[PDB]
Design a protein around this nucleic acid. Structure first.
Ligand code: AKG
Ligand code: MN
Length: 200
DNA sequence: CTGTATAACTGCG
DNA sequence: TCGCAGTTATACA
């Protein structure tokens, strides 16, 4: 069963890949194994200013690729068993294929990611983004671009659960912005993996 | 009377 | 606590 999230120019789907016990073990592995960028490679440029990102970020993928957003370029670290395990699985369930993963770790509800689009040039056109989540459940919010105001279109929000998979298809990232807002009452960490298809 | 776009923030309310 | 407005130690088209 897929919760088919749909609206005007919004095409996404949500399912639960892993039960609790497996999801726990994968999370513990991710916590044990994943290496996040620091300093220079953890700062972005937005509205003329540089900031440390209010979370942690890592990139893994096939050598030679790079991903650039908001004035920052990230080079992939070579794949590790646990990420390939997740990629290979996601690929099985979707028939889709991936060469890159951005990992975001939100230590608690005060870590977040601001409203944005994944509109970057180096993503293959048409091809989806695979968002896999572990740890604390957090709210994910979809907001229409012309809502913020020319168009009264409503917001779509859903919890992303421990062991869940959110597919983001086309034209989702051409019309809708997304964010993971601050949730002060959340005390536990969350790890998110956005598997992507990059080219250059 | 009129350019858009901004993965983050402070300053509200 | 939550969210929304404005924004610009600017970069374009
Ligand atoms: O952490 C999430 O669930 C979303 C991450 C995201 O939007 C991104 O990596 O572009
Ligand atoms: Mn995104």
């Amino acid at each position: 069963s897929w919760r088919h999230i749909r609206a005007e120019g919004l095409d996404s789907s949500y399912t639960v890949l892993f039960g609790k016990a497996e999801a726990d073990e994968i999370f513990q592995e991710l916590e044990k194994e994943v290496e996040y960028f620091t300093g220079a490679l953890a700062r972005v440029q937005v509205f003329g200013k540089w900031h440390s990102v209010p979370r942690k970020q890592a990139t893994y993928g096939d050598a030679g690729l790079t991903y650039t957003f908001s004035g920052l370029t990230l080079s992939p670290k070579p794949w590790i068993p646990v990420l390939e395990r997740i990629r290979d699985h996601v690929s099985g369930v979707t028939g889709q294929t991936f060469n890159f993963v951005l990992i975001n770790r939100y230590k608690d509800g005060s870590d977040h990611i601001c409203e944005h689009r994944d509109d970057e040039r180096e993503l293959a056109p048409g091809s989806p983004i695979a968002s896999v989540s572990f740890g604390a459940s957090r709210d994910f919010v979809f907001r229409h671009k012309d809502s913020r105001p020319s168009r009264r279109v409503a917001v779509v929000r859903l919890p992303l659960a421990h062991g869940s998979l959110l597919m983001m298809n086309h034209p989702t990232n051409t019309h809708w912005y997304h964010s993971l807002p601050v949730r002060k009452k959340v005390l536990a960490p969350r790890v998110n993996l956005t598997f992507r298809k990059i080219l250059l």
